[PDB]
Design a protein around this nucleic acid. Sequence first.
RNA 1: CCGGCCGGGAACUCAAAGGAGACUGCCAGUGAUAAACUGGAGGAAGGUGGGGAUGACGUCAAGUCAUCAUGGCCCUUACGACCAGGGCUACACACGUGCUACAAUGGCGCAUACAAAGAGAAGCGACCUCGCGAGAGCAAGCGGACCUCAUAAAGUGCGUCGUAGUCCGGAUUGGAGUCUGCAACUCGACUCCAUGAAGUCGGAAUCGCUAGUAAUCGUGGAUCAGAAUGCCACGGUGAAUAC
RNA 2: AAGAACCUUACCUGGUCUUGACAUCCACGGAAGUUUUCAGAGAUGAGAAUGUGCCUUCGGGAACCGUGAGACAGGUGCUGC
Lengths: 127, 98, 96, 206, 79, 59
Amino acid sequence: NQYYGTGRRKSSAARVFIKPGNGKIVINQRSLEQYFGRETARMVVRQPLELVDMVEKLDLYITVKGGGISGQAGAIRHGITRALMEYDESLRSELRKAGFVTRDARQVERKKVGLRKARRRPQFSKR
Amino acid sequence: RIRIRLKAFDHRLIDQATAEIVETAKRTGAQVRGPIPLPTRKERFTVLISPHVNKDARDQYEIRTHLRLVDIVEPTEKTVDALMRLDLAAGVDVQISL
Amino acid sequence: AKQSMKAREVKRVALADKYFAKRAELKAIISDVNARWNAVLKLQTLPRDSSPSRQRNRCRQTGRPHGFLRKFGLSRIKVREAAMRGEIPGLKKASW
Amino acid sequence: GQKVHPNGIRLGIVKPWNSTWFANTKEFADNLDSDFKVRQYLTKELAKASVSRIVIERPAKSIRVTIHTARPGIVIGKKGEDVEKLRKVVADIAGVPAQINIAEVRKPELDAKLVADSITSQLERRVMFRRAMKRAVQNAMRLGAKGIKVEVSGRLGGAEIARTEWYREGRVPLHTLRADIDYNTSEAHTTYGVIGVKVWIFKGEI
Amino acid sequence: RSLKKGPFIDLHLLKKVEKAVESGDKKPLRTWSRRSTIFPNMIGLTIAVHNGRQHVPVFVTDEMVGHKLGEFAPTRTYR
Amino acid sequence: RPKTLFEPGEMVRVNDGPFADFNGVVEEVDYEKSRLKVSVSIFGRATPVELDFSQVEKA
RNA sequence: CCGGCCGGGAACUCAAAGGAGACUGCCAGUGAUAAACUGGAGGAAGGUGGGGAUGACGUCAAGUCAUCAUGGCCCUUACGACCAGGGCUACACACGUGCUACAAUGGCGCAUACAAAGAGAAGCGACCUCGCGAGAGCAAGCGGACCUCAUAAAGUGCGUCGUAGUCCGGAUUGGAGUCUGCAACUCGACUCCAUGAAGUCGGAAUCGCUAGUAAUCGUGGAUCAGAAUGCCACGGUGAAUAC
RNA sequence: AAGAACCUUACCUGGUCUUGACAUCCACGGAAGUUUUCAGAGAUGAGAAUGUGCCUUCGGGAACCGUGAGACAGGUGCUGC
């Protein structure tokens, strides 16, 4: 009845519940275009759906939280990839060939002492 | 529907204390909820490591106050009469809410 | 050893404890508009050493006014020394 | 100068904390102040008794203090009267009821704080510091484990060129977090200055 | 620049002002307080303000209405 | 109930809470909560517990 | 009752303990049959996955007698203490570290969806009321997944300014004030009103950075009565190039 | 210096004390606290109103205050060669 995928993109966590139904999706009780379809990085949540190319086959419902717009988009994409993991393993091999299976291990870096930023050293003169 | 809330510096001590709490609640048998993972509060301090001058050298310290709540909802007369003197731990802070 | 400094500090703590919190919470209540005067000419007669702004948070190990922390009540050097000795509970050296 | 304090880096996993109680902030400061006052007076009173460690536990209207001691009979005194008396004055200085506890430490010349205190007392007696370190390392090897390092610094014979002597046989792996290296320092006051003694020693196989 | 709900007058300054207007005309006396608020009702004093090692006289005039007594005494010395 | 209101300096007793048959003294009274705090000495530690006037009965 | 409403396994994010996991493990080629190197399948990360702590023997008689302690010397009816003012904040100059900008990638008015990390009782203080304002009362909640700080902002849609010393920037100055503290002249921060220097992307020279990095945009904490463009710390967007 | 409005100051002008603001052993009498006056810029110099405890084998049990010399106290004074 339900097909589930979490997905995480370094500050964002999603939950994707899919019934087999109409192709229109919803993210945080509003559609994709109403949430960030006007914004950038909109095609990444369509990349697992357009790589295999189903459009109206399934019915998605995603709750995403934390992070920013592109972190939420990557989390939604990766929850879709775990849903396809729950679907089958041949499509898991296809998504591993594409590059969508891996959870991105690139988190932001801590601020360190004696430094302005995470890696930026303060400027010192020659003398 | 009373809740017992516990604070400690040592998570092993607080886990053994709440394990003895749920073991005394369940040693006969009752509908008792286990301890909840209420979030640990972290006090972090960066202080200077040299007495006179520092530019990049500072040492960093952290206190983790671990927090549990067992929320005893089932009334048992032996549990009420003798849920004292179980852990005998001096590092555990105990509060009661309702 | 700045014992003069520490004696000055504890003397102004004692004098502020003696002349504070007996009428200090009513100062704003009497002064402020309720929704010049004899009352305010009496209110502008309070001394200067009784205020808590006279106090400086100094260390209790040494009396050093700089590098203080409120939670330990100590200077930064003695906070580090007690942490490395283990005399402060729960102060494991952070490593994230 | 560039070494980390090994007890302070082993506190997370291996070394237990010297104080294990809990307090919130506005009494945390007062508990640190009373802990220092109790520890300072107890160390001053029992420096003759040559105690190893003072561990304080508080239930926030009580104090219970455990003293790790080489000689428990000196601290407990005569039929418990002397230990009851300094329990009374610890209660008087802390404002809370006090319980006393004595923990005997075996192998006093393998105990880390007592080696530093004994070398400090020997330099107060003005015997040769080099012989003091050789006796310490020899007695530790004779009646205990197989690793100890002693550093004696400051006014060693009054030389103009500063020089720190440290004696070496056995293993003291300081970067390893698993091994239980006990380390302690002490200060010896003499007519030519203060000498600092720092000792590292491990106790047992893992 | 201060609060409009209450001016700041020292009690010792107020009793010096009241005694000076009781006496009338008077030679200047040395006052150590620089934290003061003046008024057009009490414009006319010849009170002198202390700034460190030298003491300077101050003769207040009609146009100052809310200024400090320390503004007319220069604390610093420049060439 | 007669004498249903308690005051500091008056001994109270716990009926429904887990601290029956122990001595207690009233520390703080919250007028807005309409409920009272008892400072119980237990485990060697002063412990405040909040309870209701109709929930507890005095001794 | 459109405010996550209440019986519910708690599905699931999440928090917080016990663990599993990733160890060149498995297979090919290279290497001398060795260590090892390269590639591939599986897998969340593959070759100390990322980051941090951890900094050997010693050098610089490097720094601190001003955190503290201590050897020698000195004052010990003054190199001691208590005070009221002032100075540590000066100003013909010189250097170092940063912040704001020189603009259209932007400035002004309106609408719009999130963050993570925190702190809060000699406190955090929503909300009632008035004001084109800093902000003025007995206002609930909280000693903390509940309550407050706390409207996140760059961004996205518009309307406008159309490459000007300008609807760019705010220095400086003058009026009318709040908050703090007994008391803001020396010598706090702000907002209400008014002016709007220099600045047209900067010579010789020189600095940081190899990925969630540099840049850029917000947020919290320490000391703190009140006062950070500094410091610590957290998240958003997020490069280019290593022959 | 993870915070300079006289006050956190360590420096200066002026006003005050040499057992001291801070610690111990003494001789003399008493608690505390709250509203003030005569002068002061304050540090400081002198009188009013009030309670006067457990009390030890009535040595007024025990912090605390005002006088005096030596013991002493203090130094963020010098020497990090």
